[PDB]
Amino acid sequence: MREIVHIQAGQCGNQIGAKFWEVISDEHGIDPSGNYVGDSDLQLERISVYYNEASSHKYVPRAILVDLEPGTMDSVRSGAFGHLFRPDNFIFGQSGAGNNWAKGHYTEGAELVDSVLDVVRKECENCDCLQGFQLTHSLGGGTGSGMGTLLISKVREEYPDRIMNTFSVVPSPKVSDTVVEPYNATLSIHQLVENTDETYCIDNEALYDICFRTLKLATPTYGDLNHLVSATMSGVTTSLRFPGQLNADLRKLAVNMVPFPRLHFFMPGFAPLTARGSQQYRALTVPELTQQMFDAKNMMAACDPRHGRYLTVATVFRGRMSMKEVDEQMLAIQSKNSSYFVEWIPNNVKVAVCDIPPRGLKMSSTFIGNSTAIQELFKRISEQFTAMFRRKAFLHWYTGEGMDEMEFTEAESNMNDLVSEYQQYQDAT
Amino acid sequence: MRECISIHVGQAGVQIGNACWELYCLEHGIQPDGQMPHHHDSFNTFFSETGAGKHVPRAVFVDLEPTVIDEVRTGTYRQLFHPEQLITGKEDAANNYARGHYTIGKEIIDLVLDRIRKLADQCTGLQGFLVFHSFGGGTGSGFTSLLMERLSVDYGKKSKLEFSIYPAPQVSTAVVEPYNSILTTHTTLEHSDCAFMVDNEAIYDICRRNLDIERPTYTNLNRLISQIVSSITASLRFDGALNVDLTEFQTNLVPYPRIHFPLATYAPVISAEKAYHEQLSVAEITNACFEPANQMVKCDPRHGKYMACCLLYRGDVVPKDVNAAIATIKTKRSIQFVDWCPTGFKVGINYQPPTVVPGGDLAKVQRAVCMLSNTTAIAEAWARLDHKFDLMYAKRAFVHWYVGEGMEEGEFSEAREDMAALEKDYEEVGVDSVE
Amino acid sequence: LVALRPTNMDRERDKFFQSHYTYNPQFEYQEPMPTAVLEKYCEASGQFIHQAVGIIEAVLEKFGTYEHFEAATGGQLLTKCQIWSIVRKYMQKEGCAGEVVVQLSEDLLSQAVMMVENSRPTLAINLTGARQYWLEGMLRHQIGTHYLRGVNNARQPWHNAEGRLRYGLRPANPTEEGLASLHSVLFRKQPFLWRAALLYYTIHRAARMSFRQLFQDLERYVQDADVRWEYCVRAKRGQTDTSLPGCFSKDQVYLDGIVRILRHRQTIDFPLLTSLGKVSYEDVDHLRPHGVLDNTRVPHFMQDLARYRQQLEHIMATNRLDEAELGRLLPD
Numbered sequence A: 001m002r003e004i005v006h007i008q009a010g011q012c013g014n015q016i017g018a019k020f021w022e023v024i025s026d027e028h029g030i031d032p033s034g035n036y037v038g039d040s041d042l043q044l045e046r047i048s049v050y051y052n053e054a055s056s057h058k059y060v061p062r063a064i065l066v067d068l069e070p071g072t073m074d075s076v077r078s079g080a081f082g083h084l085f086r087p088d089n090f091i092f093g094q095s096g097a098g099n100n101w102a103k104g105h106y107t108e109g110a111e112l113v114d115s116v117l118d119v120v121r122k123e124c125e126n127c128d129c130l131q132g133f134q135l136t137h138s139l140g141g142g143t144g145s146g147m148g149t150l151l152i153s154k155v156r157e158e159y160p161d162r163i164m165n166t167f168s169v170v171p172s173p174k175v176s177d178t179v180v181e182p183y184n185a186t187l188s189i190h191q192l193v194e195n196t197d198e199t200y201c202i203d204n205e206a207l208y209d210i211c212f213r214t215l216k217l218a219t220p221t222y223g224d225l226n227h228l229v230s231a232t233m234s235g236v237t238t239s240l241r242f243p244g245q246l247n248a249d250l251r252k253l254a255v256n257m258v259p260f261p262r263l264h265f266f267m268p269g270f271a272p273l274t275a276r277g278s279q280q281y282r283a284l285t286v287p288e289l290t291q292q293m294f295d296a297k298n299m300m301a302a303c304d305p306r307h308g309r310y311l312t313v314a315t316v317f318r319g320r321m322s323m324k325e326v327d328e329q330m331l332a333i334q335s336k337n338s339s340y341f342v343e344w345i346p347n348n349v350k351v352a353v354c355d356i357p358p359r360g361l362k363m364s365s366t367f368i369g370n371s372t373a374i375q376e377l378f379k380r381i382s383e384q385f386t387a388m389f390r391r392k393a394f395l396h397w398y399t400g401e402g403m404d405e406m407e408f409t410e411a412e413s414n415m416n417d418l419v420s421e422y423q424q425y426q427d428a429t
Numbered sequence B: 001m002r003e004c005i006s007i008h009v010g011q012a013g014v015q016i017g018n019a020c021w022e023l024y025c026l027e028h029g030i031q032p033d034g035q036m037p038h039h040h041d042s043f044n045t046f047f048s049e050t051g052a053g054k055h056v057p058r059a060v061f062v063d064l065e066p067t068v069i070d071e072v073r074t075g076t077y078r079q080l081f082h083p084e085q086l087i088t089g090k091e092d093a094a095n096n097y098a099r100g101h102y103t104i105g106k107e108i109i110d111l112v113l114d115r116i117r118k119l120a121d122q123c124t125g126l127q128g129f130l131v132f133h134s135f136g137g138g139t140g141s142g143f144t145s146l147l148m149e150r151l152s153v154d155y156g157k158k159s160k161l162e163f164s165i166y167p168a169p170q171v172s173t174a175v176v177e178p179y180n181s182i183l184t185t186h187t188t189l190e191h192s193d194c195a196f197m198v199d200n201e202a203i204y205d206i207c208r209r210n211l212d213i214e215r216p217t218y219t220n221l222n223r224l225i226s227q228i229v230s231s232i233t234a235s236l237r238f239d240g241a242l243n244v245d246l247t248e249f250q251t252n253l254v255p256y257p258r259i260h261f262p263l264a265t266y267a268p269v270i271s272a273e274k275a276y277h278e279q280l281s282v283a284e285i286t287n288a289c290f291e292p293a294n295q296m297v298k299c300d301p302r303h304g305k306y307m308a309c310c311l312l313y314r315g316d317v318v319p320k321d322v323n324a325a326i327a328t329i330k331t332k333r334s335i336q337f338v339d340w341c342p343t344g345f346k347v348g349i350n351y352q353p354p355t356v357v358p359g360g361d362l363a364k365v366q367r368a369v370c371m372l373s374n375t376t377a378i379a380e381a382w383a384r385l386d387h388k389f390d391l392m393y394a395k396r397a398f399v400h401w402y403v404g405e406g407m408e409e410g411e412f413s414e415a416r417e418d419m420a421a422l423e424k425d426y427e428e429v430g431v432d433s434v435e
Numbered sequence C: 001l002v003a004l005r006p007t008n009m010d011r012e013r014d015k016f017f018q019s020h021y022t023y024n025p026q027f028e029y030q031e032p033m034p035t036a037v038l039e040k041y042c043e044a045s046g047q048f049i050h051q052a053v054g055i056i057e058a059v060l061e062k063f064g065t066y067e068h069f070e071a072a073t074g075g076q077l078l079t080k081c082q083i084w085s086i087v088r089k090y091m092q093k094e095g096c097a098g099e100v101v102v103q104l105s106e107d108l109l110s111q112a113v114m115m116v117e118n119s120r121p122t123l124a125i126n127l128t129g130a131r132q133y134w135l136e137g138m139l140r141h142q143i144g145t146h147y148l149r150g151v152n153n154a155r156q157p158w159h160n161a162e163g164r165l166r167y168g169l170r171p172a173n174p175t176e177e178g179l180a181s182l183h184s185v186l187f188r189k190q191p192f193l194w195r196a197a198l199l200y201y202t203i204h205r206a207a208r209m210s211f212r213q214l215f216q217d218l219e220r221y222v223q224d225a226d227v228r229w230e231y232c233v234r235a236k237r238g239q240t241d242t243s244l245p246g247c248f249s250k251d252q253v254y255l256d257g258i259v260r261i262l263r264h265r266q267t268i269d270f271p272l273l274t275s276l277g278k279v280s281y282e283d284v285d286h287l288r289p290h291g292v293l294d295n296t297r298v299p300h301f302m303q304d305l306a307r308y309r310q311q312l313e314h315i316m317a318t319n320r321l322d323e324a325e326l327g328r329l330l331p332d
């Protein structure tokens, strides 16, 4: 019950999804062929939430892989853990978004969004009681941004009651992997703050920093970053895919973390993060995890929390632990950082506890902080957008697909309004 | 022939019930499959019996998320419960009162009431209701409010006892606890005969200090609350030198229609290694019960006055010692009842000692005492919740979920007015009389 | 006031209003009527009528209308929450936290009434027209004066009727309500004794006038029909057929007490006066030798006694009750 549908847009979304399904299959003991070879019945007691039991006793992920260029699709298809996706799912086009948002939302996307929605509808009717949607996409790449926003708008039209999750890879502050990424970011954020329940902001910069310093890895390949994001997502969903002394569901997180309709952008975090050698020289206790999760050097979003306040915080543990210990740790961490939390939300730590470790550890933890610091991020992007709009640079590519300037004017105004709201609530009293 | 059904709402209720029914099945020598290889009948009051040697509990486990109920169905206590009772929803209230009282629970409330009616009509001397429900969870608050209103509509005058989990002052697992608490209190204030305040923080404290376990799981808190419940019902379920029925509870501990929130307390709670080195006098355990560090609600009794107390003893107890100990307690000044209630005790004695659950944490004792005390200190606790509510309402935080789920802001304002009125009543009663 | 609050006050009010103030209320009461108390207060005094009018005119000269006086000096109308907050702060300040039950009501003919419900003290506060800067004063009146005097009095040999006779006590009033009224306006910036003065005035006229006439007469000082209705009923408590002249003169006690206490303030020991209980200012020397003063409570606002006396001077000045005028009024 409470089945979840997985959508993967853009190249980053698809790669993250490949690693994510690898992780999930490892969790439930699923062979690459798609048949169960596990050992613990609890794996199958909720196997339906992400998988569908196809006949002859096989399992197929409830995935809907979307793209506009067959390259990465074929890469996924050929590689291992690709032979179990249901082959009818791989929707792809030929033109390619060309790293443009106008193509990804108006011209090219309008031709595949119908087939995507049809497969979505088939999967929805297949499920018993739909729980919600999780969309894995970028914010820079044209396909990800444009087509994901279009799909979100259409789905919200057809399912205004379900819950919506997005794992959007926000552009990094220092580097810029693309050139027009401010435009894509602004338009995508406009659509998201329109029609999304929660948005898990991530930067590649923070993941680089974590893989470098904390994990002591000088050679971070994209496999590792995607592995980290996959572990975060698995930690988010294990609260319902598994029994727990204090269980959680996606709707619980949405209610707890989203005080106002618009302010629903979360920065995630994971713990423990130990190098290969520096592991046996540290104790794995709940206080250690809790103290690890609260610092700028372990936030997967490149913005110091100290510059603002945590509006709300959710914390999902795993593995066998003692509830009193967790409560004591949360009390201490809420006490000593009193200036780091908003005054008018007393007891602002949502807690959930699972019963199964992330496979290969004693106990783990996932942090989901809805703070005001992220305003800086938007601030940054907004400014960049403004600059690249003041000269109307690159404007012709977007204008040529039917979009016009007033779109950009409205989107920038909307983002500035959002930043104003964040600022207002940060200094509320 | 004095039956009493149990209704467990929400995850907290279901786990507490797991503990409670484990305890019962241990007490009456009942195997997990309902078979059984001073006693009377005794078990008839809680266990109904079928043709074979198989007994089944009179419990109705209702939830909106099938996870915990599925754990129950898969646990060692699978054969026990009547499978029709284990009512499971589809999508839990997700810590939202409106979902748990207007949208979702509205679609299985009828099935729950139907099973309740079947179980009631199969009984003859029905005493009353035991609702095991938390206070912060959405299902708990909303569904319990709905169910209490429905039962009060159906069963006009019968006992209705709740075991709420009062939200702690400093440890809060939820984020919207004030909203659920205020709403469920405004609703249940007109229907619940007698609630039973218990908190997790105080039980953590007790487990750390007295039992000397530094890392307790919810299993331990559940075992303690189950022991409290068993001490409450031992009068019905056993032969005692001075028995007491739940109607006596509601008559004694409830001076006014609204002020019916007594907090629990249990003694002795000592580890197995510290079982010796003390003879456990009944006067000693009475003093332990009145010790402000042993209460199971984080409220100092010294800041208020005990409007009423009810001490239920069990084991090798002799009434003269109880009389002497209570006289001594009345002599001391730090325990100051209200002037207008000169008789502040109900005493009950049972012959059956408490039984220790194997694999447990406590030690085999010969005497035990559970105190249910209605005081005025609890009033301050409401203030705290009120305060929290005010802040979280001053910014209209989280309001959109409740608004869009079948509720209005005027309802929030009305519930705030009601809580203010209750606090006013507590303050007014706390004062002394003239002339 | 419960006994003399007409049982049909609402039905007669609607009648009065709906007739455009021409109807004479025909009140009825819970039987039997307290005949003795009615007869005791059946005659109005005019001793201080010019002081009353002096205070009323002083207000209207400075503020134009009562309506503006009320809003400008009184502060905002209070919510229930705000009332409780101010009360709680007061009780703690006075050291009598947890002693008195507080109740909120709409059906009080005054701001508040201190009672003995269930043989226990009860403060009933009128939520209708409760105001920020005024409410603190009410608490100084009922709790700071009536309640503290009451508790102190219970400890004295004259704690009951017999004790009063035996020790030869003058009545508690007008000293009681005089002290309470002065205390209500104690720390205010514009401490005009409007309520006292208008009550005194209304009773004086009530003795001569029908209800209709009395209601019309008051228009000159206060416009609000609801406010006027209150003052008229208070002045005619116990009157059945209000078409005839007649009054309940009890509420004249406030101004009567004020004038007397202010006149003799220099020779009165205010802490001692409160400590001795429900006693006249004139009985202080008589009763001082026989008072038990170990654990008697003096209000918080009397601790800085120098300041307390300054406030009394400020109250006189404000209300046009200068020394010379009090001297001529009472050449004692």
Ligand SMILES: Nc1nc2c(ncn2[C@@H]2O[C@H](COP(=O)(O)OP(=O)(O)OP(=O)(O)O)[C@@H](O)[C@H]2O)c(=O)[nH]1
Binding pocket: A245, A246, B009, B010, B011, B012, B013, B015, B016, B064, B092, B093, B094, B095, B096, B100, B134, B135, B136, B137, B138, B139, B140, B165, B173, B174, B200, B218, B219, B221, B222
């Ligand atoms: N004493 C005790 N309390 C528990 C236990 N498990 C959960 N709780 C309480 O449950 C509260 C969480 O809200 P719940 O009432 O459980 O919510 P729910 O029952 O899952 O129903 P929903 O709100 O719809 O999810 C916490 O505040 C805990 O205090 C337990 O094992 N023992």
Ligand SMILES: Nc1nc2c(ncn2[C@@H]2O[C@H](COP(=O)(O)OP(=O)(O)O)[C@@H](O)[C@H]2O)c(=O)[nH]1
Binding pocket: A009, A010, A011, A012, A013, A015, A016, A097, A098, A099, A100, A138, A139, A140, A141, A142, A143, A144, A145, A169, A171, A177, A178, A204, A222, A223, A225, A226
């Ligand atoms: N975390 C992560 N991000 C990626 C990965 N590959 C690409 N990205 C991000 O995805 C963005 C490119 O979007 P992409 O899907 O390739 O372009 P599109 O075809 O127009 O949607 C860049 O900003 C990258 O930062 C990856 O393996 N991991």
Ligand SMILES: [Mg+2]
Binding pocket: B010, B011, B065, B092, B093, B094, B137, B138, B139
């Ligand atoms: Mg639940």
Ligand SMILES: [Zn+2]
Binding pocket: C141, C146, C177, C180
């Ligand atoms: Zn008075």
